Structure 1
């Protein structure tokens, strides 16, 4: 007979704070072609896309969410990208019994089943850095940690999660300092209580300000280890900032030896995943559909998560299969898709795809250290299987990592 059309209502940020839809929409289009051309996944169903440009704006997204829900055809799932767009659609979704699957939202707040009961994300939460941090603290035998953050909900939530994770490992947070824009008084305070192991959470502009202030107070050297986020631009510390007094040399000096954690978004292995593509082939195939270069295209590094989200849905819809009967007033099919989505376990272009109880993606983390003004891969950590890959590439002045104490 005929394959029944089954619809996804997606929102792609083509502009805004995170213009991730630029590469994620083509990656979504490619994944649908790959799933629909597979006779073994949904033989009786054809998965189709209906999308709108959210502009990474919740106000804008409210207009398109209406457009998706109040116009035929009925959609079985909603796929937002930006964290602010997901916070709005994932909360609203229960009124239309809709599963919500995000390909780009990292906000820790989205891992709340009370506010977001049908929510899943192939993009991990910013809290995924915390198990890697506690493991590195354990490896190097540290139990006294200082934390410094910029005043943002994401950074406060990340540190709130780090508090409960260190308590479990018999580790404590000595000092916690915050700053809206100027980090002069928080860094001066770290020096005063003689903090040794510091977890610093801030954006790049604020990192430059933190590390200039770190040079001045000599909060770098053999004594100190800084744990930062690994998503900053290459040579961020060398970038010219007129509001910073420190020189390139001074700040290449201040950042020396610091550790970074970064969520793995593309499998570094040359293995073939469920689609039978390799990471390298996915990248080459994606580069071909793009109008501009990967460097110019927003959401290029997140594009494999968007590709994997379509596969997670396809495989979940495959496990259940009466999809045309879906209506916004019925929980039946939703709860069955929810159960199938919750039981996700497959190999995607981003690596192994699994969700925790909150619907947040579980993934590997890349651990790097800045050695001689350049980041060097010192290993990877898999939080779900407590698997640490050590490179034996890390370097310390003492010939060994220092300690939390005087």
Structure 2
């Protein structure tokens, strides 16, 4: 007769490196209202939220993790956002037999089952770009690839994964260059080695420095293809930076024709998901709940993943159905939710939700090309089904893509 309250301990980054909690906390709150109003999901239970602002800071998150674990009520799951916060809470979690479900962490290192044995994420790993990269090389028949990276853990781990994945496809990494803050030497070294197909992994500030150096060494043109990450701001190369010698037009010239990969976070299709919403309705509903405009709201694009994280948990808890008896000293309930979480398969606002063996999200990637200083959608790739959605909108100088070597 009485619905028993079951609690999620969540951490939301309202500020810091990725202030994703700005749109992910209302997306989570919306999903809890939607799950609780559905009588076919958890009829005997009411999913409640206890949350704190991590400020995308592990030090700050350490204080709130304590507050979550050492204060009643007992929480059945932890929900962090930032990778630095998830690395702390996902490693600590085994001491309280707690499942950890992140809505925003991209760090490849979180796919380690030894360090993070109860971790899942609706946000994919940064390594999800690599199967799309190998498939693009296979499509345009390239077996010799160069790699330039900024010295950061994520880019190092992503390239380490790119190495084992190219070997599987009979493709080899010719040259690997790295920089801390100033490129110039790796860019100079790329012209030196006559590298043609180049995968560049860096943040937006460093991307500008890279492409200004690309200009001077004339590393752009018909001879080369640059493979970059697709989550920089619109017109990132046009952005004014006092530390760049090159101009707007110079940068616009250096960036022409480069390819980008990015994770599909909102289903492009007009279909209805498990909530019975469309992608466009989710967006409209979320915008109403926000104090500021979507463009001024941190984590707006990731918000569907936070919404879907709640549904993945609700469906998992639904599959298990003795939730009030959960204790930090016991593994029995944890192991059952682990099993249910592992076997997730449903349609969310971000598309089809499935985790791999590491508990990392499997999703579509959007492939884009910079055509005339603007990005055009040239395709989509589904790693699990080896399905490439190709639109005949890709364009190259001389009507065709170049080759990897001398020819």
Normalising by the smaller structure, the TM-score range is over 0.9
After TM superposition, give the deviation of residue 250 of structure 1 in Å.
Answer: 1.2
Distance 1:138 1:404 in 2: 12
Residues 367-401 of structure 1: CA deviation (Å, up to 9, x unaligned): 00000111000000000110000001000112111
Tell me the distance in 2 between the aligned counterparts of 1:172 and 1:347. Answer: 37
TM-superposed CA distance for 1:242, in Å, is 1.2
User: C-alpha distance in 1, partners of 2:54/2:250?
Assistant: 42
Query: Could you give the per-residue CA deviations for residues 220-271 of structure 1, whole angstroms, max 9, x where no partner exists?
Result: 1110000000001111111111111111111111100000000111001110
- 1:369 and 1:210 map into 2 onto residues whose CA distance is 18
Q: Within 2, Cα distance between the matches of 1:84 and 1:207?
A: 22
Q: Please, which runs of 5 or more residues in structure 2 have no aligned partner?
A: none
Worse-matched range after superposition: 247-256 or 334-343: 247-256
Cα offsets for 1:178-218 (capped at 9, x unmatched):
00011100000000110010000111111111111111111
Of 339-348 and 246-255, deviating more is 246-255
For normalisation by structure 1, the TM-score amounts to: 1.00
* 1:304-326 Cα distance to aligned partner (Å, 9 max, x none): 00000000000000000000010
User: Cα distance, 1:176 vs. partner?
Assistant: 0.2
1:114-163 Cα offsets, whole Å, 9 max, x none, are 00000000000000000000000000000000000000000000000000
1:336 to 2:333 alignment: no
Question: What is the deviation of 1:345?
Answer: 0.3
- Any unmatched runs of 5+ in structure 1? none
Counterpart-to-counterpart distance in 2, 1:242 and 1:54: 32
Inter-partner Cα distance in structure 1 for 2:19 and 2:182: 27
**Distance in 2 between residues matched to 1:124 and 1:113, nearest whole Å:** 15
SS of residue in 2 equivalent to 1:86? helix
Give me the whole-angstrom Cα distance separating, in 2, the residues matched to 1:36 and 1:76.
16
In 1: Cα distance, 2:52 partner to 2:405 partner: 54
TM superposition outliers: structure 1 runs of 4+ over 3 Å? none
1:342-367, Cα deviation, whole Å (9 max, x unpaired): 00000000000000000000000000
SS at match of 1:402: coil
| SS of equivalent residue, structure 2 residue 292 | coil
Q: What CA distance in whole angstroms lies between the structure 2 residues aligned with 1:86 and 1:105?
A: 7
Distance in 2 of aligned mates of 1:152 and 1:55? 20
CA distance in 2, matches of 1:209, 1:46: 51
**Which moved further from structure 2: 34-43 or 241-250?**
241-250
Distance 1:233 1:110 in 2: 26
Residue 201 of structure 2 corresponds to residue 218 of structure 1: no
> Following the alignment from structure 1 to structure 2, what is the Cα–Cα distance between the partners of residues 61 and 242?
35
The alignment partner of 1:324 has SS state of helix
Inter-partner Cα distance in structure 2 for 1:26 and 1:140? 43
TM-superposed deviation, 1:101:
0.1
Partner SS state of residue 273, structure 2: coil
SS in 2 for 1:228: strand
Whole-angstrom distance in 1 between the partners of 2:62 and 2:214: 43
Once the 2 structures are TM-superposed, how far is the Cα of residue 113 of structure 1 from its aligned partner?
0.2
Distance in 1 of aligned mates of 2:56 and 2:76: 22
1:85-119 deviations in Å (ceiling 9; x for gaps): 10000000000000000000001100000000000
- Mapped to 1, the partners of 2:94 and 2:147 lie a distance apart of 37
Distance 1:19 1:247 in 2: 30
- Aligned pairs for 1:1-400 (under 5 A) are 1-400=1-400
Could you state the TM-score of these two structures normalised by the residue count of structure 2? 0.99
SS at match of 2:368: strand
SS class of match (1:379) = strand
